[PDB]
Amino acid sequence: PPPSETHKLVVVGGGGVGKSALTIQFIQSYFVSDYDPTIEDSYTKICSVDGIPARLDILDTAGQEEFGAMREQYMRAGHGFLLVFAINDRQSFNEVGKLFTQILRVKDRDDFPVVLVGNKADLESQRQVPRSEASAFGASHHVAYFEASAKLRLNVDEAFEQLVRAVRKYQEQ
Numbered sequence: 625p626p627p628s629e630t631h632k633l634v635v636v637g638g639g640g641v642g643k644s645a646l647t648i649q650f651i652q653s654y655f656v657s658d659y660d661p662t663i664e665d666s667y668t669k670i671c672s673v674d675g676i677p678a679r680l681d682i683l684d685t686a687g688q689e690e691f692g693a694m695r696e697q698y699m700r701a702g703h704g705f706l707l708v709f710a711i712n713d714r715q716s717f718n719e720v721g722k723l724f725t726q727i728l729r730v731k732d733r734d735d736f737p738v739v740l741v742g743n744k745a746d747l748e749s750q751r752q753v754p755r756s757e758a759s760a761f762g763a764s765h766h767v768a769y770f771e772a773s774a775k776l777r778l779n780v781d782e783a784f785e786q787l788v789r790a791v792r793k794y795q796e797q
């Protein structure tokens with residue numbers, strides 16, 4: 625039952641990058657390889673980060689294009705964003721640039737809680753975005769970057785946990 629340790633988190637990124645697979649890994653701790661791309665759902669997880677309990681309300685977006693809500697709605701409501709691309713899809717990496725610019729336009733500041741996730745780390749030979757390039761993009765935006773694999777449950781908890789940290793330090797203002 626935490627108090628202002630209740631955080632509305634939004635998972636955003638291009639289709640097919642692993643938003644559902646990542647979110648389901650965090651909530652359910654197993655890999656779903658074929659999650660209905662049309663389903664946009666919110667989840668809740670109560671968990672401890674840095675020794676402090678937190679209520680996390682996580683929206684797994686299906687995109688505004690066909691199936692989901694207009695993004696400005698949940699982008700305004702969101703307390704923190706998990707910005708996902710896939711390391712074997714440069715177009716998905718371009719899409720996170722666009723999403724980042726939109727978030728900071730909606731918040732009217734360049735310092736809102738965001739964590740960058742490059743998913744599908746298990747497909748190293750298929751990489752299209754160098755780790756150094758993705759890292760630079762994160763650094764230039766003052767955010768943490770994780771390479772994750774929803775398939776192998778690598779850096780799933782760690783990415784979401786870091787996002788909670790960013791939201792906390794932000795609202796220490």
Ligand SMILES: Nc1nc2c(ncn2[C@@H]2O[C@H](COP(=O)(O)OP(=O)(O)O)[C@@H](O)[C@H]2O)c(=O)[nH]1
Pocket residue numbers: 637638639640641642643644645646656657658659660661743744745746747772773774775776
């Ligand atoms: N190899 C690999 N494939 C993944 C990973 N995460 C998701 N996928 C695959 O990527 C596709 C899209 O994943 P999904 O969770 O539906 O992505 P979403 O559209 O962003 O919600 C599916 O075919 C998944 O099996 C991963 O970590 N590694």
Ligand SMILES: [Mg+2]
Pocket residue numbers: 643644645659660661662663684685686
């Ligand atoms: Mg999905």
